[PDB]
Amino acid sequence: HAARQLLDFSQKLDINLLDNVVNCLYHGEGAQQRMAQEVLTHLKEHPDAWTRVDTIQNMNTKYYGLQILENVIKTRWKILPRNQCEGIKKYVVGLIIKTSSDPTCVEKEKVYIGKLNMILVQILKQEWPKHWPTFISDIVGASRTSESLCQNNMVILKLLSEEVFDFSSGQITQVKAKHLKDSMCNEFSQIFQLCQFVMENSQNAPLVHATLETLLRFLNWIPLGYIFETKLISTLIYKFLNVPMFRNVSLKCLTEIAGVSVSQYEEQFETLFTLTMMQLKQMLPLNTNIRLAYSNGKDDEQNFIQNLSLFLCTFLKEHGQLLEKRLNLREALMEALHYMLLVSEVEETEIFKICLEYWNHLAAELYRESPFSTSASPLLSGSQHFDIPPRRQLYLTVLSKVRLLMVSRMAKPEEVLVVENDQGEVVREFMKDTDSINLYKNMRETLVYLTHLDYVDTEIIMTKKLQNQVNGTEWSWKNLNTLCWAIGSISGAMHEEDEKRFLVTVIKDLLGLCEQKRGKDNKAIIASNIMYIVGQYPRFLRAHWKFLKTVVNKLFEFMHETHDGVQDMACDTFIKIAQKCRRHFVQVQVGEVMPFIDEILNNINTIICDLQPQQVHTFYEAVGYMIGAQTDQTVQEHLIEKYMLLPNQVWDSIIQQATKNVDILKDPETVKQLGSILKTNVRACKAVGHPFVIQLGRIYLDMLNVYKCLSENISAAIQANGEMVTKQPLIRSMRTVKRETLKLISGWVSRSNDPQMVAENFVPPLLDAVLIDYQRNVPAAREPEVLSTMAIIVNKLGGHITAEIPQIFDAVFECTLNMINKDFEEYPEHRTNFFLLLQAVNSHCFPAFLAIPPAQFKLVLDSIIWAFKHTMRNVADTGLQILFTLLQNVAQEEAAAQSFYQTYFCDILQHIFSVVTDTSHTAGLTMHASILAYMFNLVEEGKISTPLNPGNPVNNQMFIQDYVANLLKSAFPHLQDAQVKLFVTGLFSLNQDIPAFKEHLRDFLVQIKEFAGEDTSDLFLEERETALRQAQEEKHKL
Amino acid sequence: QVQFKLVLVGDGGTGKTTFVKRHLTGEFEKKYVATLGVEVHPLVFHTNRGPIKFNVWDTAGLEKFGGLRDGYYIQAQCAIIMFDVTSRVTYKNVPNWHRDLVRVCENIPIVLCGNKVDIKDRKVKAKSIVFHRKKNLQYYDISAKSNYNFEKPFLWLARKLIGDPNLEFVAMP
Amino acid sequence: PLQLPPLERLTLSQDLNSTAAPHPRLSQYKSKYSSLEQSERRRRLLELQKSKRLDYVNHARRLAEDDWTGMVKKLPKHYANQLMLSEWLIDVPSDLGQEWIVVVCPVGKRALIVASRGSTSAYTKSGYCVNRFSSLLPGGNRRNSTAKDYTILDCIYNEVNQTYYVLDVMCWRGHPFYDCQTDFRFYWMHSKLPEEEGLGEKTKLNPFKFVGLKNFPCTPESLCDVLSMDFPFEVDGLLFYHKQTHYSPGSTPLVGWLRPYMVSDVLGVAVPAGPLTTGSSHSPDHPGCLMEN
């Protein structure tokens, strides 16, 4: 039922509303209309506030009422009649006292309590100092009489602290927050006494824990004096840390204090550390299996370990520098370094990431002390070399353990993700920057640091690990993969000569392990690792042709292996090796009389006959790299012709048949082939580079014909049966020939190197084939990639295409614009791309925007406005980048410059403020501020024409400030003139400090959400007023 | 086979809705149509210890489409904060979301999800994502566009709620 | 002065004279360990070994109904390694001219065709599905038997001619042919293929034309005529089946392989055709399709 209950002056009940809330939280499809009505109740005001919270599944209904009350205090509080404000003060304070002194807080969930407390802080935020003077004192006294009225107060302070020091930025104006920051500081001692008294005397656990918790939020700002020049640290370590239900809060506090970046309290830190360690060695014995304690632990024994990671890591990373200089501490530091090593064995990615963060820092700190190994051989008189640098000396044996750690827990290097693309095409994707790959990166880096300080140690670690697999028989796939991952991660960290000795031993014995182990199961896992290792050391392959040769052939053999994954392994390695040894395949090696490529090319079919489609592409890409090495024109051309001979046969075949019956380019199978042929053509091009032109040219024209054939076949199918058709085999297949065709076209022009030749031959046929086709397509059939493909070519060709923008923009621009000008949702890709294109043209072909008529130009600029009004972050940002850039492009041509200002200046200014004052575009904050600042800074000189009717009477700076003031005040009439005038003035003073300019904007966004009212005037003119001129006078000073 | 209340929060365009759709339909929404208020979505996973149901309260990220914001969280039993690696702003606001949430839910298994890992030009390097550490939250790198670590957030929350560190999804009828 | 690892001996399988690697006469003469020079004796042992300990009737069904619930040694449990593969022909048979036969193979893709439950699927040696489609093979079209009538073929797929070249047959109309001498298997092919409506033609219900590969005697005079023939495809190599072989998946010396050039220098024959072993500016690219612009 509707049950709309806004009926204002109807003496409306409470038993009804109480029912809807119960549905918004329990029922189902009903909740749709339940939420749809309560969200609406927020219309007139909150007279229901009293009757509701008063009347009473009820706390939920009271929580609701509180939100309304909460909104009132954050919105119209300042323009409330004083007596009414105070009416709420007592209404809340008492409501709290009532329910905060309430015998049973938890059942009337801490939720209702917490929200109430929050509302009080909401109120304090609005008057605490000026109109609630006795507050801080009263709540202290109240705490010292009632334990209950104390515990909750410890929560009231925690919230107030967060709201003033932790979450003020954005929700509070800059100057008001400082006034609050002071107010909290000027009267904090009184409150510190309270917490302190509680800690030393209070027998009650909850009250105490909530006081330690309220303490954890204080250590973010309280004057250092309170921490290091009191008994605070001593209290936490002796009293609260040793006991179970306090060990976490206690430690988390110590951790926050251990991270102070100051050089004034060197003594306190030393004792803080050694004092903690004692407690630690009593709590968690240095001989316990920390991993088991975790594996076999709950949400208490687990967090402690995590907090231990944070404490240990944060402290050593900071004050660990001074733990070395002293001598008395040189013992507790080793104990601490011992914990980390135990903690590091915890099967838990997030904990292991924390520890690693330290190790990487340690091995880095000792790498800049000395990057070199110590001179192995002792002195003639048997003494010690000192070769060992001062600091590393202390960590020597710990470092060895850390090397063991990296070698035993090494993460997977690469991350394969199998996912089928938007076609049903199954593939293998490669992640690039996942968190996992970052873990690997750090491990590799730590071990690469340690290997430089002592590579002998590294090689010994790895030789024992490798041996234990071979006969020590701690053999398993998981470990063997880890050992070889680690081995490969240090490639190039040794002297070449050492690397040679290392590699030959390592794989020689793996080559033995693969023989003793039986079953294609084991042998494949081993062979892959061998193949991974040999793939990581091109330096070694590039010096030993015979080996390289033997490796490649082995890969060619593995390419007929039917055991799972082997063929993917063998291809990955081959492309890898080709890339890094490309030169050795095209130049004749010792012992040969013909470049290896030849053998490879005269056999492509016998090698890849058993590979899958995608693998065949990866293989073609690999040979492509070899081809790219032959710099000699003549020979590279012959190589290329034969390289593309196999795929060409299919092409040439499909083509002649299409020149007899064009219904063939409609054949499912032949279209499947045209796709794969093209896909092959795309990879070859990616590797061969520019020289590949000889190929593209050979098929460029026909390829466009078929593209257009398919593009017209698809559009018709859609026009005849609606979008739906796109969602079936043949169409999705035809889409593929189009998309790869576009990949190929753009993919080559990118790596081309003769702009003009490209603009005079490979561009004009694009017009009729791809552009006017995109034009004639039905909206649902147009390819978004057409726009992005064109964007790329503009970026490359630049000035050489500036004369074709007319012809291009015709086809795509207006027609595409009409697809994205109704709302902000439909045709996403078309939005994104279209503006990458518009960006590019404006960026590298600006002259075009001048050639066209003012009527067309306008249509372009207003399209940009349209961009930065988007809620899709990327589209709106591209719009600013364009606008910001466009403004600068205009700064060049003196003539056509002023005109722009006379016509668009104010219009653009208005539009920018339109999105600045909107709560939905807060991510363009920086770009927003940048553009404005630039425009205002421009106002003080540049614009030298009349914006107004009169002439000199109003300098642009005056008309512009008044135009803005008018626009802002007219758009936000609840603001008082002072608010606005202040703002507008800051726009010309902060015009040379974007960061400052930003804050200014952010402040105005706060004041609009609030009705400041001509009444209250708790702003800060004189203060801020001059503070703006401190910046206004930095532009002409230095 | 009992269920649980899962509240999903984050900035706009974060991919909250898109993430949920993927799970139930398997389809991927390319368009950005902002959620007004909330949209309860029941999700089901089949584990080795009986079926499990998540009531996904896909809330809104935008400020004007807020709703009964903090009001939705009540009675929650786990949560998922989500940000977009292509926009740092959506990671710097995470603290704000975790705030409102714990002031309503004092102790509930939460997960932090960095969405959009598939987009090559990632503006939020992993080195920076450390907020979960001191607040003892779980974290994962995800992509609704590639099903990368697709089911991690839910698998983890299940481990906690059913008090079993060895629960595994299987998709048995 | 360098002593580098013997990577050459790295091997996954124990397949003697594998075609996965170049001939044993190129690498190193007596090749390596898992390579032989005597294909002879093993052939006799394998043919003598001919008796039936394996249930092929039950296997064809599993292939056809994708069921591996479990209920010279064993049958591969999936779509990988179901094809009978050849070793290089090294130990040229003494009774070759009257006991062996040769099938001129085309360039393309070896596949396992499985037609059952109204559909036809082609897998690779690796068990990778390459295409699902409709066919006129007994059990491979939507108009067929939902009552135990499936087909399993060993084929080579050629792209230019969009034709699956049937190389052999291990199951037809629901009856396993594994337990049959190649002699018979081949006959059954060139006797039952052409007797299928339009199995050798392209239509909506049969997109891919199934064509049977001819075979010829291996007599001295015969091989000569073969090496100078014309085929509807480009020649890849030659297969040599011993007339008395059953069809056993995996490597076997009872069928050998050789490239066209290798023949007239491994036996003794002529060498013409196949033995030959492996203002004014410039804008120059012409189109065959020829449309508007």
Ligand SMILES: Nc1nc2c(ncn2[C@@H]2O[C@H](COP(=O)(O)OP(=O)(O)OP(=O)(O)O)[C@@H](O)[C@H]2O)c(=O)[nH]1
């Ligand atoms: N490339 C890429 N895009 C994504 C991914 N996930 C979501 N998107 C896109 O980002 C936008 C996010 O849309 P939504 O799922 O509605 O985001 P939301 O969190 O629900 O936004 P609100 O409902 O306003 O809070 C959509 O356009 C998606 O197509 C992703 O993993 N990769």
Ligand SMILES: [Mg+2]
């Ligand atoms: Mg949503």
